[PDB]
Design a binder for this molecule. Structure first.
Ligand SMILES: CC[C@H](C)[C@H](N)C(=O)O
Ligand SMILES: CC[C@H](C)[C@H](N)C(=O)O
Lengths: 180, 180
Protein backbone atom coordinates (compact mmCIF):
# COMPACT_ATOMS: atom_id res chain seq x y z
CA UNK A 1 0.00 0.00 0.00
CA UNK A 2 2.44 2.70 1.14
CA UNK A 3 4.22 4.00 -1.95
CA UNK A 4 7.06 6.14 -0.51
CA UNK A 5 9.80 5.78 2.09
CA UNK A 6 11.38 8.84 3.69
CA UNK A 7 14.81 8.21 5.24
CA UNK A 8 17.28 10.15 7.38
CA UNK A 9 20.74 8.61 6.82
CA UNK A 10 24.12 9.42 8.38
CA UNK A 11 27.17 9.01 6.13
CA UNK A 12 30.75 10.04 6.80
CA UNK A 13 31.60 13.62 5.93
CA UNK A 14 34.50 12.85 3.57
CA UNK A 15 35.24 12.91 -0.16
CA UNK A 16 33.73 9.98 -2.07
CA UNK A 17 31.23 9.21 0.69
CA UNK A 18 28.11 10.14 -1.23
CA UNK A 19 29.16 8.03 -4.21
CA UNK A 20 29.71 4.98 -1.95
CA UNK A 21 26.31 5.51 -0.31
CA UNK A 22 24.56 5.85 -3.70
CA UNK A 23 26.30 2.66 -4.90
CA UNK A 24 24.75 0.74 -1.99
CA UNK A 25 21.32 2.16 -2.95
CA UNK A 26 21.85 1.18 -6.62
CA UNK A 27 18.94 -1.23 -7.02
CA UNK A 28 16.34 1.12 -5.47
CA UNK A 29 14.06 3.78 -6.98
CA UNK A 30 15.34 6.89 -5.19
CA UNK A 31 13.27 9.94 -6.11
CA UNK A 32 14.89 12.57 -3.83
CA UNK A 33 18.25 13.24 -2.18
CA UNK A 34 18.98 16.37 -0.15
CA UNK A 35 22.16 17.34 1.73
CA UNK A 36 24.07 20.42 2.86
CA UNK A 37 27.41 20.56 4.69
CA UNK A 38 26.74 20.82 8.45
CA UNK A 39 28.69 18.67 10.92
CA UNK A 40 32.40 18.26 10.14
CA UNK A 41 32.44 14.50 10.76
CA UNK A 42 29.01 13.08 9.90
CA UNK A 43 26.78 14.19 7.05
CA UNK A 44 22.99 13.94 7.10
CA UNK A 45 21.16 12.80 3.94
CA UNK A 46 17.43 13.08 3.31
CA UNK A 47 16.27 10.28 0.95
CA UNK A 48 12.87 9.78 -0.68
CA UNK A 49 12.28 6.36 -2.25
CA UNK A 50 9.46 5.21 -4.52
CA UNK A 51 8.22 1.76 -3.39
CA UNK A 52 6.52 -0.92 -5.42
CA UNK A 53 6.36 -3.55 -2.65
CA UNK A 54 5.28 -1.35 0.22
CA UNK A 55 6.44 -2.12 3.73
CA UNK A 56 8.32 -5.23 2.61
CA UNK A 57 10.56 -3.06 0.44
CA UNK A 58 10.84 -0.32 3.07
CA UNK A 59 12.11 -2.91 5.56
CA UNK A 60 14.52 -4.38 2.97
CA UNK A 61 16.08 -0.96 2.40
CA UNK A 62 16.37 -0.19 6.12
CA UNK A 63 18.02 -3.57 6.72
CA UNK A 64 20.35 -3.13 3.74
CA UNK A 65 21.55 0.24 5.02
CA UNK A 66 22.18 -1.04 8.54
CA UNK A 67 23.93 -4.17 7.17
CA UNK A 68 26.08 -1.90 5.03
CA UNK A 69 27.26 0.13 8.01
CA UNK A 70 24.99 3.18 7.77
CA UNK A 71 22.76 4.61 10.48
CA UNK A 72 19.21 5.36 9.37
CA UNK A 73 16.14 6.86 11.00
CA UNK A 74 12.90 5.84 9.26
CA UNK A 75 10.73 8.96 8.67
CA UNK A 76 8.23 7.20 6.38
CA UNK A 77 5.42 7.44 8.97
CA UNK A 78 6.57 10.75 10.51
CA UNK A 79 3.83 13.37 10.02
CA UNK A 80 6.22 16.27 10.45
CA UNK A 81 8.50 14.81 7.77
CA UNK A 82 5.52 14.35 5.41
CA UNK A 83 3.91 17.74 6.02
CA UNK A 84 6.86 20.04 6.72
CA UNK A 85 10.44 18.85 7.08
CA UNK A 86 10.69 17.29 3.58
CA UNK A 87 10.43 20.89 2.26
CA UNK A 88 12.97 22.36 4.72
CA UNK A 89 16.08 20.17 4.62
CA UNK A 90 19.38 21.66 3.51
CA UNK A 91 19.52 25.41 3.93
CA UNK A 92 22.82 27.26 4.49
CA UNK A 93 26.12 25.52 5.29
CA UNK A 94 27.36 25.51 8.88
CA UNK A 95 30.09 28.03 8.01
CA UNK A 96 30.94 30.00 4.85
CA UNK A 97 32.37 27.88 2.02
CA UNK A 98 34.21 28.57 -1.20
CA UNK A 99 32.09 26.52 -3.59
CA UNK A 100 30.95 26.41 -7.21
CA UNK A 101 27.32 25.44 -7.90
CA UNK A 102 26.15 23.48 -10.96
CA UNK A 103 22.85 22.17 -12.25
CA UNK A 104 22.52 19.05 -14.40
CA UNK A 105 19.75 17.01 -16.04
CA UNK A 106 19.52 13.62 -17.71
CA UNK A 107 16.84 11.30 -19.08
CA UNK A 108 15.85 8.72 -16.49
CA UNK A 109 16.73 5.07 -17.03
CA UNK A 110 17.80 2.36 -14.60
CA UNK A 111 21.05 3.51 -12.98
CA UNK A 112 21.04 6.92 -14.69
CA UNK A 113 21.85 8.92 -11.53
CA UNK A 114 24.62 6.54 -10.53
CA UNK A 115 26.20 6.66 -14.00
CA UNK A 116 26.10 10.46 -13.70
CA UNK A 117 27.69 10.46 -10.23
CA UNK A 118 30.54 8.25 -11.40
CA UNK A 119 31.46 10.89 -14.00
CA UNK A 120 31.98 13.68 -11.43
CA UNK A 121 35.13 12.42 -9.78
CA UNK A 122 35.67 11.98 -6.07
CA UNK A 123 38.52 14.49 -6.21
CA UNK A 124 35.92 17.19 -5.43
CA UNK A 125 34.18 17.49 -2.07
CA UNK A 126 30.40 17.92 -2.42
CA UNK A 127 29.01 20.61 -0.09
CA UNK A 128 25.39 20.72 -1.37
CA UNK A 129 23.43 18.06 -3.18
CA UNK A 130 19.81 17.94 -4.33
CA UNK A 131 18.26 15.39 -6.67
CA UNK A 132 14.63 15.09 -7.66
CA UNK A 133 13.03 12.71 -10.13
CA UNK A 134 9.30 12.10 -9.63
CA UNK A 135 8.00 10.32 -12.73
CA UNK A 136 9.41 13.14 -14.87
CA UNK A 137 11.20 11.86 -17.96
CA UNK A 138 14.33 13.73 -16.62
CA UNK A 139 16.23 13.59 -13.37
CA UNK A 140 17.42 16.93 -11.99
CA UNK A 141 20.57 17.55 -9.92
CA UNK A 142 21.90 20.68 -8.19
CA UNK A 143 25.31 20.24 -6.55
CA UNK A 144 28.02 22.47 -5.05
CA UNK A 145 31.70 21.50 -5.19
CA UNK A 146 34.17 22.94 -2.69
CA UNK A 147 37.20 24.81 -4.04
CA UNK A 148 40.69 23.61 -3.12
CA UNK A 149 43.92 24.82 -4.71
CA UNK A 150 41.89 25.36 -7.88
CA UNK A 151 38.31 25.58 -8.88
CA UNK A 152 36.20 22.96 -10.67
CA UNK A 153 35.45 23.53 -14.35
CA UNK A 154 32.83 20.95 -15.33
CA UNK A 155 30.73 22.51 -18.08
CA UNK A 156 32.49 21.43 -21.26
CA UNK A 157 33.19 17.84 -20.17
CA UNK A 158 29.75 17.27 -18.64
CA UNK A 159 27.95 18.89 -21.58
CA UNK A 160 29.88 16.56 -23.90
CA UNK A 161 28.50 13.59 -21.94
CA UNK A 162 24.91 14.86 -22.29
CA UNK A 163 24.26 16.19 -18.79
CA UNK A 164 23.11 19.76 -19.57
CA UNK A 165 25.47 21.37 -17.07
CA UNK A 166 25.07 25.04 -16.08
CA UNK A 167 27.01 27.14 -13.57
CA UNK A 168 24.42 28.25 -10.97
CA UNK A 169 26.83 29.96 -8.56
CA UNK A 170 25.14 33.32 -9.18
CA UNK A 171 21.60 31.94 -9.30
CA UNK A 172 19.36 34.36 -7.34
CA UNK A 173 17.45 31.66 -5.45
CA UNK A 174 20.68 29.99 -4.31
CA UNK A 175 22.29 33.33 -3.41
CA UNK A 176 19.29 34.54 -1.41
CA UNK A 177 18.50 31.38 0.59
CA UNK A 178 21.28 28.77 0.56
CA UNK A 179 24.61 30.59 0.41
CA UNK A 180 26.83 30.80 3.46
CA UNK B 1 -1.62 31.59 -17.56
CA UNK B 2 1.07 31.28 -14.88
CA UNK B 3 -0.62 30.03 -11.72
CA UNK B 4 2.08 30.46 -9.03
CA UNK B 5 4.43 33.20 -7.83
CA UNK B 6 7.59 32.34 -5.90
CA UNK B 7 9.00 35.22 -3.84
CA UNK B 8 12.14 35.89 -1.80
CA UNK B 9 11.30 38.65 0.72
CA UNK B 10 13.47 40.43 3.29
CA UNK B 11 11.75 41.46 6.54
CA UNK B 12 13.32 42.83 9.70
CA UNK B 13 14.57 40.23 12.15
CA UNK B 14 12.56 41.41 15.17
CA UNK B 15 9.54 40.29 17.20
CA UNK B 16 6.21 40.96 15.50
CA UNK B 17 7.81 41.31 12.06
CA UNK B 18 6.28 38.22 10.52
CA UNK B 19 2.80 39.20 11.68
CA UNK B 20 3.17 42.68 10.11
CA UNK B 21 4.38 41.13 6.85
CA UNK B 22 1.49 38.63 6.77
CA UNK B 23 -0.97 41.48 7.44
CA UNK B 24 0.27 43.25 4.29
CA UNK B 25 -0.23 40.01 2.32
CA UNK B 26 -3.77 39.59 3.75
CA UNK B 27 -5.74 39.72 0.50
CA UNK B 28 -3.54 37.18 -1.34
CA UNK B 29 -3.70 33.39 -1.65
CA UNK B 30 -0.40 32.42 -0.02
CA UNK B 31 0.17 28.66 -0.22
CA UNK B 32 3.67 28.43 1.32
CA UNK B 33 5.84 30.32 3.79
CA UNK B 34 9.29 29.13 4.87
CA UNK B 35 11.79 30.81 7.23
CA UNK B 36 14.60 29.93 9.62
CA UNK B 37 16.65 32.29 11.80
CA UNK B 38 19.85 33.23 9.94
CA UNK B 39 21.05 36.84 9.81
CA UNK B 40 20.66 38.79 13.07
CA UNK B 41 19.20 41.90 11.40
CA UNK B 42 17.30 40.83 8.28
CA UNK B 43 15.20 37.70 7.90
CA UNK B 44 14.62 35.92 4.59
CA UNK B 45 11.13 34.58 3.79
CA UNK B 46 10.27 32.16 1.00
CA UNK B 47 6.66 32.75 -0.20
CA UNK B 48 4.60 30.70 -2.65
CA UNK B 49 1.40 32.36 -3.90
CA UNK B 50 -1.48 30.86 -5.88
CA UNK B 51 -2.49 33.25 -8.69
CA UNK B 52 -5.82 33.59 -10.41
CA UNK B 53 -4.90 36.58 -12.61
CA UNK B 54 -1.47 35.47 -13.73
CA UNK B 55 1.23 38.03 -14.36
CA UNK B 56 -1.10 40.93 -13.58
CA UNK B 57 -1.50 39.62 -10.04
CA UNK B 58 2.18 38.73 -9.71
CA UNK B 59 3.08 42.33 -10.58
CA UNK B 60 0.44 43.70 -8.17
CA UNK B 61 1.96 41.70 -5.30
CA UNK B 62 5.53 42.73 -6.15
CA UNK B 63 4.47 46.39 -6.31
CA UNK B 64 2.50 46.12 -3.06
CA UNK B 65 5.49 44.70 -1.21
CA UNK B 66 7.86 47.37 -2.49
CA UNK B 67 5.29 50.12 -1.74
CA UNK B 68 4.95 48.70 1.76
CA UNK B 69 8.68 48.95 2.44
CA UNK B 70 9.80 45.36 1.81
CA UNK B 71 12.54 44.17 -0.52
CA UNK B 72 11.54 41.30 -2.79
CA UNK B 73 13.31 39.20 -5.39
CA UNK B 74 10.89 37.58 -7.87
CA UNK B 75 11.76 33.86 -8.25
CA UNK B 76 8.59 32.98 -10.19
CA UNK B 77 10.53 32.33 -13.43
CA UNK B 78 13.71 31.03 -11.74
CA UNK B 79 14.32 27.43 -12.84
CA UNK B 80 16.51 26.66 -9.85
CA UNK B 81 13.79 27.91 -7.50
CA UNK B 82 11.18 25.77 -9.31
CA UNK B 83 13.26 22.60 -9.56
CA UNK B 84 15.44 22.69 -6.45
CA UNK B 85 15.57 25.61 -4.04
CA UNK B 86 11.84 25.54 -3.13
CA UNK B 87 12.59 22.17 -1.45
CA UNK B 88 15.76 23.36 0.35
CA UNK B 89 14.92 26.61 2.14
CA UNK B 90 15.20 26.79 5.91
CA UNK B 91 17.54 24.19 7.35
CA UNK B 92 19.40 24.75 10.64
CA UNK B 93 19.59 28.11 12.43
CA UNK B 94 22.76 30.18 12.14
CA UNK B 95 23.71 29.36 15.74
CA UNK B 96 22.19 27.09 18.41
CA UNK B 97 18.88 28.33 19.84
CA UNK B 98 16.77 27.51 22.85
CA UNK B 99 13.41 27.01 21.16
CA UNK B 100 10.16 25.08 21.51
CA UNK B 101 8.60 23.63 18.33
CA UNK B 102 4.85 23.30 17.72
CA UNK B 103 2.66 22.05 14.91
CA UNK B 104 -0.83 23.40 14.22
CA UNK B 105 -3.64 22.83 11.70
CA UNK B 106 -6.86 24.62 10.80
CA UNK B 107 -9.57 24.43 8.15
CA UNK B 108 -8.88 26.87 5.34
CA UNK B 109 -11.14 29.88 4.85
CA UNK B 110 -10.38 33.44 3.78
CA UNK B 111 -8.00 34.91 6.36
CA UNK B 112 -7.64 31.67 8.33
CA UNK B 113 -3.82 31.82 8.61
CA UNK B 114 -3.89 35.47 9.64
CA UNK B 115 -6.54 34.84 12.31
CA UNK B 116 -4.30 32.04 13.60
CA UNK B 117 -1.18 34.23 13.64
CA UNK B 118 -2.96 36.94 15.61
CA UNK B 119 -3.64 34.41 18.39
CA UNK B 120 0.05 33.58 18.96
CA UNK B 121 1.18 36.84 20.50
CA UNK B 122 4.15 38.90 19.40
CA UNK B 123 5.71 38.45 22.84
CA UNK B 124 7.45 35.35 21.42
CA UNK B 125 10.21 35.53 18.81
CA UNK B 126 9.65 33.07 15.93
CA UNK B 127 12.85 31.23 14.95
CA UNK B 128 11.37 28.74 12.42
CA UNK B 129 8.19 29.01 10.41
CA UNK B 130 6.70 26.75 7.75
CA UNK B 131 3.20 26.95 6.32
CA UNK B 132 1.74 24.88 3.51
CA UNK B 133 -1.79 24.87 2.15
CA UNK B 134 -2.17 23.56 -1.41
CA UNK B 135 -5.88 23.02 -2.04
CA UNK B 136 -6.02 20.79 1.05
CA UNK B 137 -9.06 21.48 3.21
CA UNK B 138 -6.55 22.24 6.07
CA UNK B 139 -3.65 24.61 6.40
CA UNK B 140 -0.58 23.26 8.20
CA UNK B 141 1.90 25.25 10.31
CA UNK B 142 5.16 24.27 12.01
CA UNK B 143 6.75 27.03 14.10
CA UNK B 144 9.53 27.36 16.69
CA UNK B 145 9.38 29.97 19.46
CA UNK B 146 12.55 31.16 21.17
CA UNK B 147 12.79 30.81 24.96
CA UNK B 148 13.38 33.91 27.08
CA UNK B 149 13.09 34.07 30.86
CA UNK B 150 10.44 31.36 30.54
CA UNK B 151 9.26 28.91 27.99
CA UNK B 152 6.11 29.09 25.86
CA UNK B 153 3.22 26.82 26.83
CA UNK B 154 0.70 27.01 23.98
CA UNK B 155 -1.06 23.65 23.85
CA UNK B 156 -4.07 24.15 26.09
CA UNK B 157 -4.95 27.65 24.87
CA UNK B 158 -4.42 26.87 21.18
CA UNK B 159 -6.27 23.56 21.40
CA UNK B 160 -9.19 25.42 22.98
CA UNK B 161 -9.28 27.70 19.92
CA UNK B 162 -9.36 24.72 17.52
CA UNK B 163 -5.81 24.75 16.20
CA UNK B 164 -4.74 21.14 16.91
CA UNK B 165 -1.49 22.14 18.60
CA UNK B 166 1.22 19.55 19.33
CA UNK B 167 4.69 19.96 20.85
CA UNK B 168 7.12 18.78 18.14
CA UNK B 169 10.36 19.70 19.93
CA UNK B 170 11.39 16.04 20.06
CA UNK B 171 10.10 15.17 16.59
CA UNK B 172 12.74 12.93 14.92
CA UNK B 173 12.67 14.71 11.56
CA UNK B 174 13.16 18.11 13.19
CA UNK B 175 15.88 16.79 15.51
CA UNK B 176 17.81 15.08 12.72
CA UNK B 177 17.73 17.84 10.08
CA UNK B 178 16.69 21.26 11.40
CA UNK B 179 17.95 21.58 14.97
CA UNK B 180 20.91 23.78 15.79
C1 LIG C 1 26.85 14.22 0.35
C2 LIG C 1 28.29 14.64 0.19
C3 LIG C 1 29.23 13.82 1.11
C4 LIG C 1 28.85 14.01 2.58
C5 LIG C 1 30.69 14.22 0.85
N1 LIG C 1 30.91 15.66 1.14
C6 LIG C 1 31.08 13.84 -0.56
O1 LIG C 1 31.70 14.66 -1.29
O2 LIG C 1 30.90 12.66 -0.99
C1 LIG D 1 9.58 35.09 10.46
C2 LIG D 1 9.86 35.47 11.90
C3 LIG D 1 10.33 36.94 12.03
C4 LIG D 1 11.61 37.18 11.23
C5 LIG D 1 10.50 37.31 13.51
N1 LIG D 1 11.53 36.45 14.15
C6 LIG D 1 9.17 37.25 14.21
O1 LIG D 1 9.07 36.67 15.33
O2 LIG D 1 8.16 37.87 13.76
Amino acid sequence: EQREALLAVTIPEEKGSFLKFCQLLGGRSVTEFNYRFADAKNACIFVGVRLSRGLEERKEILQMLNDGGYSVVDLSDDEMAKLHVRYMVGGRPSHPLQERLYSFEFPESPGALLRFLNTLGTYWNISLFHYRSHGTDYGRVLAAFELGDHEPDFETRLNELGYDCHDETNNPAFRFFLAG
